[PDB]
Amino acid sequence: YILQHADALVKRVSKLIVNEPAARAALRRGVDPRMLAAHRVVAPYVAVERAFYAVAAIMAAQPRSARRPNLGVSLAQAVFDKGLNADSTEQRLHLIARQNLDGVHRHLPRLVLYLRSDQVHIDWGILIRDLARWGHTPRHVAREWVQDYHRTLETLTRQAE
Amino acid sequence: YILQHADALVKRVSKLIVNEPAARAALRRGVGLAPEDPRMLAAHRVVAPYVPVHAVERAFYAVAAIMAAQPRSARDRPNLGVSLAQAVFDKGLNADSTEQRLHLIARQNLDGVHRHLPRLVLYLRSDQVHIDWGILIRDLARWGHTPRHVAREWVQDYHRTLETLTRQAE
Amino acid sequence: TFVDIHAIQTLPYSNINRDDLGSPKTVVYGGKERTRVSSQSWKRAVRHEVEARLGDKAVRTRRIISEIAKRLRERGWDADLADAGARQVVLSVGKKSGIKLEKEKDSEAPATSVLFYLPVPAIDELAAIADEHRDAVAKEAAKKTPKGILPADRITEVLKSRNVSVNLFGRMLAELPSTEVDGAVQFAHAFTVHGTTVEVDFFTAVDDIPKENDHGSGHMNAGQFSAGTFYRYANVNLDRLVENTGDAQTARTAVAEFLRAFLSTVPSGKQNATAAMTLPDLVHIAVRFDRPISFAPAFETALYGSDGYTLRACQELNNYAERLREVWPDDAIRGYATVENKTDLAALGERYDSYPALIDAMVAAA
Amino acid sequence: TFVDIHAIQTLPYSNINRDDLGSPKTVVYGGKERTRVSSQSWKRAVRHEVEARLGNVSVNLFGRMLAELPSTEVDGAVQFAHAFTVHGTTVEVDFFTAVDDIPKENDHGSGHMNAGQFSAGTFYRYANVNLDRLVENTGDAQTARTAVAEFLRAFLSTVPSGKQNATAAMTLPDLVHIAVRFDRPISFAPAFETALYGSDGYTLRACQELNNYAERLREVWPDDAIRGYATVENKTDLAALGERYDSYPALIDAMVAAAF
Amino acid sequence: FAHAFTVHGTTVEVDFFTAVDDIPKENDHGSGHMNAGQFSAGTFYRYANVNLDRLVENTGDAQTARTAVAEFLRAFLSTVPSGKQNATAAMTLPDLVHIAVRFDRPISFAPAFETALYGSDGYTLRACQELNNYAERLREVWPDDAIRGYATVENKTDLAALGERYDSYPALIDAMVAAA
RNA sequence: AUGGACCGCCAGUGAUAAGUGGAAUGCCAUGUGGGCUGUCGAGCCCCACGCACGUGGGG
DNA sequence: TTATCACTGGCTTCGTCCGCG
DNA sequence: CGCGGACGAAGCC
């Protein structure tokens, strides 16, 4: 379900950001009245509402240099490949895995936007449905993110035998 | 199967414990708590990669943490029932009372075993009782499919080994 | 001709009826243990409410001799003559010399071997029959092995007198099979819809006057309990009830009061400590003409859990009722009454706003 | 021409028939004891609904009237298999106490302590009826119609009467499968020679297991057997059992029609 | 007297605590290890019955039954078990009270809260509204002449089904006990 | 058509009454996120005008 | 801590007594 | 007054 509308947002929005600057600048200011300029693009496809609006905006606030796996596997592969700090991205993962629905959207933007910095691949659709899964199973999604991270880090280290 | 990864956890952990103070304190804070709970996430960093239904993962996390929350006095193929009966006969623990606690665990569910289990096992390891953690792990894994079977094995092993230990003292 | 009633009723930390050790009775049903309330206990609660409400009281007792002796003593008999006369009452019946008696206990009249289930005025009538033969009993008490003197036919005719409870639930008396009456009500064992593990409560009793030994070391016994949404079912074979009571109007009053009692009563098991009194969340009366059909298989697959079972249970009984009406076509008059309004529950027939309205409509429909 | 029926009827906590003691009858099969309701008990119940509904086809369809002297036809051309549980079942003891109504200046010394055994499970029931002997003996083919149709519906609807007032075990079969076979009768009993594991229920699992066994036997012996089955679940398909029917009497009608 | 359970699901919160040794030891300070004691919080539902005819049979007099019942109800609201309080001061008055005088039978409202409340927002209002809805539904399903009545701290709702509202707990108790 | 064929173990039943798990408890002492950096000719069609360089209207 | 713990039957032939018609 | 049904007499400790 949800993932279907999420894919509509990823293609449609993925085109408007890379294509039209005024919309890109009007949605990125909302990563509240200050984000109403964004509804005009994202509102018709929408706890899930908070998820969609936030992920579209954050997805849209990336630098141009940055313009089914989860987020944990993307982080572990970013550590192993791009050589980011491992132990520090480690505590930030452990801090997000405890937040509530409102905390994920306030702790999330730094790691995801910085992760996309230095061109790390991030499947936004899974991330969207994940932010939607905080309304019903926050702890479950958190556990999946962390587990995926460590498991894929271990397998990526062991396959480098 | 399962027992193979369980043995990796027993050497690793048991080896990563007495050889680490920060990891020991970070995994012990999650005894008797769901793996879903945030408070045990500091433990995944040590145990998460060996998790081979869902009941399992809960099993490995459980034992691992509970095994790690013992006092140092306890730090350094039989089941748990035989370990309890031999602990009664040898160490002289109460028999009739450990008896009702055994009879209460044998009825629990997958979530109840991990909440009633820590007192008897951690207290059993208190006063240095030998406990084969690998069998216990696979046992906690066997609650997802055959809870009643594993419970029956635990109790039977306890009474049978108690009887044989009493009769061999002829 | 078969009124059958289904009901879903939750009970919180109830432990209404215990085995010999205090654990709630359990069924390993569908592969999963589910606490149950025995049918005989709830059947007793229903019969006590029905008898209390309709005014006619039945007495199931093994010690009839003592009671008849008390009534005859209130009639002006001496205590010893009352005892001998009541012994004659129970001795003058049965094939052999008399009804088997338990070993006499010092200071009290012997208890009968088998339990008797007869109305109270019938006991008074037995006292009267023993009273009009006062001289025969007085003469026979002197004999070493007194024999029965009272007419056997008259006593057997009094023991055949039926209460509403006997007409409804039936009775059995092995020594006098002519009096045995077949029950008109089938009462199923109420089990939980979902699997329930028995929760252990560790309780202690405080000693009020302070002592050092009294506290610290001392520990006090652990008591078991359980909670859950019980499924309940019961049948009333109307033709047999009409044959037992004889009149159809008395059958109607008996059935209506029985169903209402069936909803109203609760077994009272440690209720002074748990207060489990609760009304059923759903009731489904059906007037089946071919055969009564319980919906227990609907819940043979245990519910998974994590979320409130009442709604999922009601939807499951609804869905299963629909499928049975498709698979087994019938003209049975269905009907239900529920507290939740989240669903229409189309298969359970016409909805009635209240339990008494439902009962009255259904019983009037038969 | 033999028409045989397989049913997977479940029964809640009950003691429909019992041994000389209180415990229910049990057949140790597949290494696991499993409760059973003997064939004669269920058959006698069937005899009462069939004869009650019919208002001498009963001495023909069933062997011989219990209270009549042998009339040279003691056989019946109907073969009831003993119903047995799909899974292993521990006899579940129910402790009960009869209450003494009159009370002395003592408390609760109840009238009668005891314990009676009960059990619950999903019985796999099975029966076959030899149409050919029935036609040769009854004569009229229409009498055969009413006998087999009415016998079949009776086979589904009835349940033995034993300790039922204390336990309401009335129920409808979850699965019915009538296979008009011309070669020979076959019971799918060995499908459950390995008792199914528990904790999630058995109706669906037993359904699919019987489907596997039907698939395989039909593979070893492809035949012209006319088949059909009806269930109380629409969620799972059982292609090996034939065409699906919306209801039990519809199925029975189609198979009695299929026989002639 | 029914077992008071939480309306919502509550996970036990382990509370790590230590005891400081007052005379300084250099190693002990760095080690600093002590046991963890577990607590919990939540909105409990509470229920109780008083079978008046039996109480009159026990005391004998009806007047002593009145003083006993009224004083009992007031005690029922006022008291708190005091288990581990010098460490956590949990003295609290009930947010809502609903006395009913049932003549046919007592009816507990525990099924109203069998579906645990989801959360993230304050449970008090949702619990009160749910008890209201269930009380309404039971008077609909089970018609009766039982004299109802309630007293509540929140003013966000009128709670029509809980009968006539009384301004204070002693006023409610006095009215109801005098009403029986 | 088998030491077989036909074939009910079955009618009844409160497990009851009573009950603090209670008293006490700092996870404390220590820490840069640091260095690098201008955002500056394909755009698809119709029409009008034009000095065919382009201008303008509409999508 | 204490009290409670069922009955009934699945043998033989005939005669006599009793209930009924 | 006749017919039908039910119980008893052992053998058995």
PDB file of N, CA and C in Angstrom, chain C residues 10 12-13 260 263-266 271-275 277-279 281 307-311 338-339 351 353-356, chain E residues 1-3 5 47-49 54 104-111 114-116 118 130 133-134 137-138 140-143:
ATOM      1  N   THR C  10     -16.023 -11.009  28.256  1.00  0.00           N
ATOM      2  CA  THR C  10     -14.698 -10.901  28.849  1.00  0.00           C
ATOM      3  C   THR C  10     -14.737 -10.901  30.369  1.00  0.00           C
ATOM      4  N   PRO C  12     -11.976 -10.023  33.637  1.00  0.00           N
ATOM      5  CA  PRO C  12     -10.631  -9.544  33.961  1.00  0.00           C
ATOM      6  C   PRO C  12     -10.004 -10.088  35.229  1.00  0.00           C
ATOM      7  N   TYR C  13      -8.958 -10.900  35.095  1.00  0.00           N
ATOM      8  CA  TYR C  13      -8.218 -11.432  36.239  1.00  0.00           C
ATOM      9  C   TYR C  13      -9.201 -12.129  37.178  1.00  0.00           C
ATOM     10  N   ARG C 260     -32.424 -15.020  30.214  1.00  0.00           N
ATOM     11  CA  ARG C 260     -32.023 -13.808  30.908  1.00  0.00           C
ATOM     12  C   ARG C 260     -31.077 -14.136  32.053  1.00  0.00           C
ATOM     13  N   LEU C 263     -27.579 -14.795  30.832  1.00  0.00           N
ATOM     14  CA  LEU C 263     -26.784 -13.612  30.556  1.00  0.00           C
ATOM     15  C   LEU C 263     -26.360 -12.963  31.859  1.00  0.00           C
ATOM     16  N   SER C 264     -27.275 -12.939  32.821  1.00  0.00           N
ATOM     17  CA  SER C 264     -27.081 -12.179  34.044  1.00  0.00           C
ATOM     18  C   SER C 264     -26.091 -12.824  35.008  1.00  0.00           C
ATOM     19  N   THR C 265     -26.118 -14.140  35.168  1.00  0.00           N
ATOM     20  CA  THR C 265     -25.338 -14.720  36.253  1.00  0.00           C
ATOM     21  C   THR C 265     -23.863 -14.879  35.911  1.00  0.00           C
ATOM     22  N   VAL C 266     -23.054 -14.920  36.965  1.00  0.00           N
ATOM     23  CA  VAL C 266     -21.607 -15.127  36.915  1.00  0.00           C
ATOM     24  C   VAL C 266     -21.231 -16.091  38.045  1.00  0.00           C
ATOM     25  N   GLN C 271     -14.877 -14.053  44.015  1.00  0.00           N
ATOM     26  CA  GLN C 271     -15.311 -12.726  43.619  1.00  0.00           C
ATOM     27  C   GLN C 271     -15.147 -11.714  44.729  1.00  0.00           C
ATOM     28  N   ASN C 272     -15.076 -12.147  45.978  1.00  0.00           N
ATOM     29  CA  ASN C 272     -14.879 -11.151  47.008  1.00  0.00           C
ATOM     30  C   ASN C 272     -13.481 -10.573  46.930  1.00  0.00           C
ATOM     31  N   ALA C 273     -12.642 -11.110  46.053  1.00  0.00           N
ATOM     32  CA  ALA C 273     -11.288 -10.638  45.882  1.00  0.00           C
ATOM     33  C   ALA C 273     -10.982 -10.156  44.473  1.00  0.00           C
ATOM     34  N   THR C 274     -11.844 -10.418  43.487  1.00  0.00           N
ATOM     35  CA  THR C 274     -11.588  -9.983  42.116  1.00  0.00           C
ATOM     36  C   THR C 274     -12.701  -9.154  41.489  1.00  0.00           C
ATOM     37  N   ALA C 275     -13.944  -9.280  41.938  1.00  0.00           N
ATOM     38  CA  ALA C 275     -15.092  -8.555  41.390  1.00  0.00           C
ATOM     39  C   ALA C 275     -15.208  -8.647  39.870  1.00  0.00           C
ATOM     40  N   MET C 277     -17.677  -9.400  38.013  1.00  0.00           N
ATOM     41  CA  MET C 277     -19.033  -9.263  37.479  1.00  0.00           C
ATOM     42  C   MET C 277     -19.055  -8.428  36.204  1.00  0.00           C
ATOM     43  N   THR C 278     -19.564  -9.004  35.116  1.00  0.00           N
ATOM     44  CA  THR C 278     -19.451  -8.393  33.798  1.00  0.00           C
ATOM     45  C   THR C 278     -20.578  -8.879  32.901  1.00  0.00           C
ATOM     46  N   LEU C 279     -21.098  -7.990  32.047  1.00  0.00           N
ATOM     47  CA  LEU C 279     -22.074  -8.384  31.031  1.00  0.00           C
ATOM     48  C   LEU C 279     -21.418  -8.793  29.720  1.00  0.00           C
ATOM     49  N   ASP C 281     -20.339  -9.069  26.011  1.00  0.00           N
ATOM     50  CA  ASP C 281     -20.206  -8.062  24.977  1.00  0.00           C
ATOM     51  C   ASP C 281     -21.100  -8.380  23.799  1.00  0.00           C
ATOM     52  N   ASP C 307      -3.535  -6.984  20.211  1.00  0.00           N
ATOM     53  CA  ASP C 307      -4.597  -5.996  20.159  1.00  0.00           C
ATOM     54  C   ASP C 307      -5.853  -6.577  20.801  1.00  0.00           C
ATOM     55  N   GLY C 308      -6.769  -5.701  21.198  1.00  0.00           N
ATOM     56  CA  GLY C 308      -8.001  -6.108  21.859  1.00  0.00           C
ATOM     57  C   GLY C 308      -8.816  -7.167  21.138  1.00  0.00           C
ATOM     58  N   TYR C 309      -9.061  -8.293  21.813  1.00  0.00           N
ATOM     59  CA  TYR C 309      -9.721  -9.446  21.205  1.00  0.00           C
ATOM     60  C   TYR C 309     -11.223  -9.325  21.002  1.00  0.00           C
ATOM     61  N   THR C 310     -11.923  -8.427  21.691  1.00  0.00           N
ATOM     62  CA  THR C 310     -13.379  -8.410  21.558  1.00  0.00           C
ATOM     63  C   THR C 310     -13.817  -8.150  20.131  1.00  0.00           C
ATOM     64  N   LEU C 311     -13.292  -7.094  19.521  1.00  0.00           N
ATOM     65  CA  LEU C 311     -13.706  -6.758  18.169  1.00  0.00           C
ATOM     66  C   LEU C 311     -13.357  -7.863  17.186  1.00  0.00           C
ATOM     67  N   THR C 338     -25.442  -6.363  20.587  1.00  0.00           N
ATOM     68  CA  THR C 338     -24.028  -6.135  20.821  1.00  0.00           C
ATOM     69  C   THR C 338     -23.807  -4.754  21.402  1.00  0.00           C
ATOM     70  N   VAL C 339     -22.732  -4.603  22.171  1.00  0.00           N
ATOM     71  CA  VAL C 339     -22.368  -3.265  22.617  1.00  0.00           C
ATOM     72  C   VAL C 339     -21.611  -2.482  21.548  1.00  0.00           C
ATOM     73  N   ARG C 351     -30.884  -7.126  14.195  1.00  0.00           N
ATOM     74  CA  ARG C 351     -30.325  -6.638  15.441  1.00  0.00           C
ATOM     75  C   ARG C 351     -31.418  -6.108  16.352  1.00  0.00           C
ATOM     76  N   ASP C 353     -32.091  -4.005  20.099  1.00  0.00           N
ATOM     77  CA  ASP C 353     -31.379  -2.987  20.859  1.00  0.00           C
ATOM     78  C   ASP C 353     -30.930  -3.448  22.237  1.00  0.00           C
ATOM     79  N   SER C 354     -31.608  -4.415  22.847  1.00  0.00           N
ATOM     80  CA  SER C 354     -31.291  -4.775  24.221  1.00  0.00           C
ATOM     81  C   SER C 354     -31.440  -6.273  24.412  1.00  0.00           C
ATOM     82  N   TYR C 355     -30.737  -6.792  25.412  1.00  0.00           N
ATOM     83  CA  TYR C 355     -30.807  -8.225  25.681  1.00  0.00           C
ATOM     84  C   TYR C 355     -32.211  -8.674  26.050  1.00  0.00           C
ATOM     85  N   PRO C 356     -32.947  -7.999  26.935  1.00  0.00           N
ATOM     86  CA  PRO C 356     -34.308  -8.473  27.212  1.00  0.00           C
ATOM     87  C   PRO C 356     -35.225  -8.381  26.012  1.00  0.00           C
TER      88      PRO C 356
ATOM     89  N   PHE E   1     -13.854  -6.358  45.826  1.00  0.00           N
ATOM     90  CA  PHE E   1     -12.825  -5.400  45.447  1.00  0.00           C
ATOM     91  C   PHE E   1     -12.010  -5.903  44.267  1.00  0.00           C
ATOM     92  N   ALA E   2     -12.182  -5.276  43.104  1.00  0.00           N
ATOM     93  CA  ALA E   2     -11.490  -5.679  41.888  1.00  0.00           C
ATOM     94  C   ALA E   2     -10.032  -5.232  41.850  1.00  0.00           C
ATOM     95  N   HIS E   3      -9.224  -5.995  41.107  1.00  0.00           N
ATOM     96  CA  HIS E   3      -7.823  -5.683  40.823  1.00  0.00           C
ATOM     97  C   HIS E   3      -7.685  -4.520  39.850  1.00  0.00           C
ATOM     98  N   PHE E   5      -6.146  -2.358  37.283  1.00  0.00           N
ATOM     99  CA  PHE E   5      -5.148  -2.461  36.224  1.00  0.00           C
ATOM    100  C   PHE E   5      -5.065  -1.172  35.419  1.00  0.00           C
ATOM    101  N   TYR E  47     -12.530  -0.644  40.617  1.00  0.00           N
ATOM    102  CA  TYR E  47     -13.933  -1.013  40.738  1.00  0.00           C
ATOM    103  C   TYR E  47     -14.203  -1.750  42.034  1.00  0.00           C
ATOM    104  N   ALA E  48     -15.393  -1.550  42.599  1.00  0.00           N
ATOM    105  CA  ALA E  48     -15.734  -2.250  43.832  1.00  0.00           C
ATOM    106  C   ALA E  48     -17.243  -2.310  44.015  1.00  0.00           C
ATOM    107  N   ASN E  49     -17.712  -3.388  44.635  1.00  0.00           N
ATOM    108  CA  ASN E  49     -19.117  -3.602  44.925  1.00  0.00           C
ATOM    109  C   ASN E  49     -19.327  -3.637  46.423  1.00  0.00           C
ATOM    110  N   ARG E  54     -26.439  -8.051  52.362  1.00  0.00           N
ATOM    111  CA  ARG E  54     -25.552  -8.848  53.196  1.00  0.00           C
ATOM    112  C   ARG E  54     -24.865  -7.988  54.244  1.00  0.00           C
ATOM    113  N   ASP E 104     -30.588  -4.893  40.449  1.00  0.00           N
ATOM    114  CA  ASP E 104     -30.540  -6.266  39.949  1.00  0.00           C
ATOM    115  C   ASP E 104     -29.158  -6.896  40.128  1.00  0.00           C
ATOM    116  N   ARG E 105     -28.118  -6.220  39.689  1.00  0.00           N
ATOM    117  CA  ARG E 105     -26.769  -6.772  39.687  1.00  0.00           C
ATOM    118  C   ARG E 105     -25.672  -5.742  39.478  1.00  0.00           C
ATOM    119  N   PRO E 106     -24.524  -5.940  40.105  1.00  0.00           N
ATOM    120  CA  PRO E 106     -23.382  -5.071  39.837  1.00  0.00           C
ATOM    121  C   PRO E 106     -22.799  -5.397  38.480  1.00  0.00           C
ATOM    122  N   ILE E 107     -22.355  -4.364  37.773  1.00  0.00           N
ATOM    123  CA  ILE E 107     -21.786  -4.507  36.442  1.00  0.00           C
ATOM    124  C   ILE E 107     -20.491  -3.726  36.387  1.00  0.00           C
ATOM    125  N   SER E 108     -19.373  -4.426  36.248  1.00  0.00           N
ATOM    126  CA  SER E 108     -18.083  -3.766  36.122  1.00  0.00           C
ATOM    127  C   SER E 108     -17.874  -3.302  34.693  1.00  0.00           C
ATOM    128  N   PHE E 109     -17.148  -2.201  34.545  1.00  0.00           N
ATOM    129  CA  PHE E 109     -16.830  -1.649  33.237  1.00  0.00           C
ATOM    130  C   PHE E 109     -15.441  -2.020  32.753  1.00  0.00           C
ATOM    131  N   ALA E 110     -14.881  -3.118  33.235  1.00  0.00           N
ATOM    132  CA  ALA E 110     -13.560  -3.518  32.768  1.00  0.00           C
ATOM    133  C   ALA E 110     -13.487  -3.846  31.286  1.00  0.00           C
ATOM    134  N   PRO E 111     -14.487  -4.448  30.649  1.00  0.00           N
ATOM    135  CA  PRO E 111     -14.378  -4.664  29.203  1.00  0.00           C
ATOM    136  C   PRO E 111     -14.208  -3.404  28.410  1.00  0.00           C
ATOM    137  N   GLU E 114     -10.475  -3.237  27.670  1.00  0.00           N
ATOM    138  CA  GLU E 114      -9.667  -4.383  27.272  1.00  0.00           C
ATOM    139  C   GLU E 114      -8.810  -4.052  26.060  1.00  0.00           C
ATOM    140  N   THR E 115      -9.302  -3.218  25.153  1.00  0.00           N
ATOM    141  CA  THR E 115      -8.467  -2.696  24.084  1.00  0.00           C
ATOM    142  C   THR E 115      -7.595  -1.589  24.650  1.00  0.00           C
ATOM    143  N   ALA E 116      -6.308  -1.853  24.773  1.00  0.00           N
ATOM    144  CA  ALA E 116      -5.403  -0.885  25.363  1.00  0.00           C
ATOM    145  C   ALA E 116      -5.421   0.399  24.555  1.00  0.00           C
ATOM    146  N   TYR E 118      -3.878   3.505  22.628  1.00  0.00           N
ATOM    147  CA  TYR E 118      -2.645   3.599  21.849  1.00  0.00           C
ATOM    148  C   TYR E 118      -1.620   4.525  22.485  1.00  0.00           C
ATOM    149  N   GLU E 130     -14.043   7.017  27.117  1.00  0.00           N
ATOM    150  CA  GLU E 130     -14.362   5.629  26.815  1.00  0.00           C
ATOM    151  C   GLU E 130     -15.264   5.019  27.875  1.00  0.00           C
ATOM    152  N   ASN E 133     -18.676   6.287  27.013  1.00  0.00           N
ATOM    153  CA  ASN E 133     -19.301   5.581  25.907  1.00  0.00           C
ATOM    154  C   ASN E 133     -19.757   4.187  26.318  1.00  0.00           C
ATOM    155  N   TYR E 134     -18.949   3.477  27.096  1.00  0.00           N
ATOM    156  CA  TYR E 134     -19.356   2.142  27.506  1.00  0.00           C
ATOM    157  C   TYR E 134     -20.515   2.183  28.486  1.00  0.00           C
ATOM    158  N   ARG E 137     -23.551   2.642  26.396  1.00  0.00           N
ATOM    159  CA  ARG E 137     -23.897   1.427  25.694  1.00  0.00           C
ATOM    160  C   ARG E 137     -24.480   0.374  26.629  1.00  0.00           C
ATOM    161  N   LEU E 138     -23.997   0.279  27.865  1.00  0.00           N
ATOM    162  CA  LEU E 138     -24.612  -0.703  28.749  1.00  0.00           C
ATOM    163  C   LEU E 138     -26.008  -0.312  29.185  1.00  0.00           C
ATOM    164  N   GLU E 140     -28.016   1.126  27.371  1.00  0.00           N
ATOM    165  CA  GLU E 140     -28.820   0.805  26.203  1.00  0.00           C
ATOM    166  C   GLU E 140     -29.057  -0.693  26.107  1.00  0.00           C
ATOM    167  N   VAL E 141     -27.997  -1.485  26.243  1.00  0.00           N
ATOM    168  CA  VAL E 141     -28.101  -2.930  26.094  1.00  0.00           C
ATOM    169  C   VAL E 141     -28.831  -3.567  27.270  1.00  0.00           C
ATOM    170  N   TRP E 142     -28.602  -3.069  28.483  1.00  0.00           N
ATOM    171  CA  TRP E 142     -29.216  -3.593  29.703  1.00  0.00           C
ATOM    172  C   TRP E 142     -30.063  -2.552  30.419  1.00  0.00           C
ATOM    173  N   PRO E 143     -31.333  -2.404  30.053  1.00  0.00           N
ATOM    174  CA  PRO E 143     -32.145  -1.347  30.656  1.00  0.00           C
ATOM    175  C   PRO E 143     -32.327  -1.597  32.138  1.00  0.00           C
TER     176      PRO E 143
END
